[PDB]
């Protein structure tokens, strides 16, 4: 899976926005591939990191990090006020066929669009 | 919203399966809401637990899928291996609705991208 530009569509609350994000190499220290949006400022861009490990089981980790900028008085370069995170960690075992892993990935993907999660995440109301 | 039956369509490798799951109560000790499939055996049941904290709001979603196997010289099947999944959102106090919706949709759409469908199915680094 060679790194390449990823254009995510239908993103947003209204399902109208879309974002293009391009790779920025792999860290040799721990093999964590990184991708980010060309936001003209390195400190105020949305970034994604993906890394699959090696065994006694495999572990896939995906992190999403996007900051929110603000122009505070007394300075010219905008700083970072608040920062939104997201973490995902699959923990498949050695003897797991690809069908089971695909099932896990698909149910996780479709569970983030069901009426339960799109409500428990947007308004932070606990499920009862 | 209160817990209710959740049905998921176009699930699987080819998107030709459907997974229906129903609630299984709420644990009062730590406030996790559970859901599970009607698998007719409590041990071999795909389950999903969702829980939001109260202050740095934190949202945690945990998915457990065990797999069965015919025990040698026995009748009751045992859980040979389990597939795990975890999601942890960490929105702050002043975050608006648009930012959280954007993060959720990003995680939902990126997870079906050609990069992730190969990183997860084929276990090859990017």
């Amino acid at each position: 899976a060679k790194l390449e530009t990823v254009t995510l569509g239908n993103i947003g609350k209204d399902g109208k926005q879309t974002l293009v994000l391009n790779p920025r190499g792999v860290n040799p220290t721990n093999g964590v591939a990184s991708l980010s949006q060309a936001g003209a400022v390195p400190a105020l861009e949305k970034r994604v990191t993906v890394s699959v490990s090696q065994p006694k089981n495999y572990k896939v980790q995906v992190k999403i990090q996007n900051p929110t900028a603000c122009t505070a008085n007394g300075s010219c370069d905008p700083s970072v006020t608040r920062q939104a995170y997201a973490d995902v960690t699959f923990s498949f075992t050695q003897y797991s066929t690809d069908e089971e892993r695909a099932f896990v990935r698909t149910e996780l993907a479709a569970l983030l669009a069901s009426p339960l999660l799109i409500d428990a995440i947007d308004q932070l109301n606990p499920a009862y | 919203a209160k817990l209710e039956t959740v049905t998921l369509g176009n699930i699987g490798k080819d998107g030709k399966q459907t997974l229906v799951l129903n609630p299984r109560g709420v644990n009062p000790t730590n406030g996790v809401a559970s859901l599970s499939q009607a698998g007719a055996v409590p041990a071999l049941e795909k389950r999903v637990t969702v829980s939001v904290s109260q202050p740095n709001y934190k949202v945690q979603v945990k998915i457990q899928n065990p797999t069965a196997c015919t025990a040698n010289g026995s009748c009751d099947p045992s859980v040979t291996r389990q597939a795990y999944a975890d999601v942890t959102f960490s929105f702050t106090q002043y975050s608006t609705d648009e930012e959280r919706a954007f993060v959720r949709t990003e995680l939902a759409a990126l997870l079906a991208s050609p990069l992730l469908i190969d990183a997860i199915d084929q276990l090859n680094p990017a």
Partner: antibody
Amino acid sequence: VQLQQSGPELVKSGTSVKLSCKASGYSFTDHSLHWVKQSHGESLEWIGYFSPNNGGTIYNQKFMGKATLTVDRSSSTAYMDLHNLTSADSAVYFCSTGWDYGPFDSWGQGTTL
Amino acid sequence: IVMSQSPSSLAVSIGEKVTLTCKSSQSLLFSSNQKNYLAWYQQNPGQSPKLLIYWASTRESGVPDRFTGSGSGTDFTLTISSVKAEDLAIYYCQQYFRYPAFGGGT
């Protein structure tokens, strides 16, 4: 979000023109303000936009010479000029807005030339 | 990109299940995930047009259920579910990635 203002400009000859689009209710932080032209008849074709995150000076080909898209961020208005007016000035020039790469959400009424 | 659409005029009067066909000269699966990039606009002869469908299969808020569409790699269609007294006039189609380009007629 709504956007309006126009003016039935009826000036002749190729001296100059100044069309404007006073957009309100939205900020230029991510959105793009397109300038689709309808001509007269069939098939209105795009004329460019202004995206701060994409450059803000993307112009359609075969329209580079007679187009100039300058946007003032103080009052949140976008206006353009056409240098030469011989036969391109035919009919309405719509003013458009939308997301960064999304569809065109809402269009205000256009000037008549 | 060029968007060649079905001939300018139709002949349906009332109630008939009439479909609008659009054909592109290039693949429109620009998005990394399989999402098309078409939008269908209808323009009355008097004022500015309105958006009807984006992603070629998703309706826009505040639009009646008649308008539905299906999308393939490059051969898309718009299937209005019967026509009422005022559902006429030009039905433009547009791809809206990188350089947009309209095209078509009634």
